[PDB]
Amino acid sequence: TVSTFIDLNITMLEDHEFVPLEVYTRHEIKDSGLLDYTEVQRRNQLHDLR
Amino acid sequence: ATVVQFEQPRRCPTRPEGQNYTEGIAVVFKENIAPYKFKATMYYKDVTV
């Protein structure tokens, strides 16, 4: 068999899922400061009851 | 001796039926990072000697 047809190949672009990605979370940013003022306050205001 | 033939028509791809979508209203909630905030009144007396 010979053919008079001209081929053409089209495959659909497959699905692709995007997972959530973060370089730094806000908890790491809150921990970036050398002294979280709030936690220092809460610790130091327990001295009499401790 | 040598004898060839023409190729016959082909089955073309069916156009896919397609997706079905549900129409709706949506409200997206997130994690709360705001502290609970409430107003209060302080009573005290400064003393000095």
Ligand SMILES: *[C@@H]1O[C@H](CO)[C@@H](O[C@@H]2O[C@H](CO)[C@@H](O)[C@H](O)[C@H]2NC(C)=O)[C@H](O)[C@H]1NC(C)=O
């Ligand atoms: C039609 O579609 C693609 C080319 O776009 C070919 O399919 C891939 O071929 C590679 C090798 O080139 C295989 O490893 C894969 O398994 C094939 N499938 C996919 C999804 O990648 C296919 O060969 C083409 N048709 C012809 C007749 O070559």
Ligand SMILES: *[C@@H]1O[C@H](CO)[C@@H](O[C@@H]2O[C@H](CO)[C@@H](O)[C@H](O)[C@H]2NC(C)=O)[C@H](O)[C@H]1NC(C)=O
């Ligand atoms: C969305 O709804 C249409 C309604 O026509 C579905 O059509 C179906 O097409 C498939 C082919 O894959 C047949 O097997 C079913 O019998 C059809 N159903 C009806 C009721 O016509 C269509 O398939 C639906 N969505 C998906 C993703 O299949």
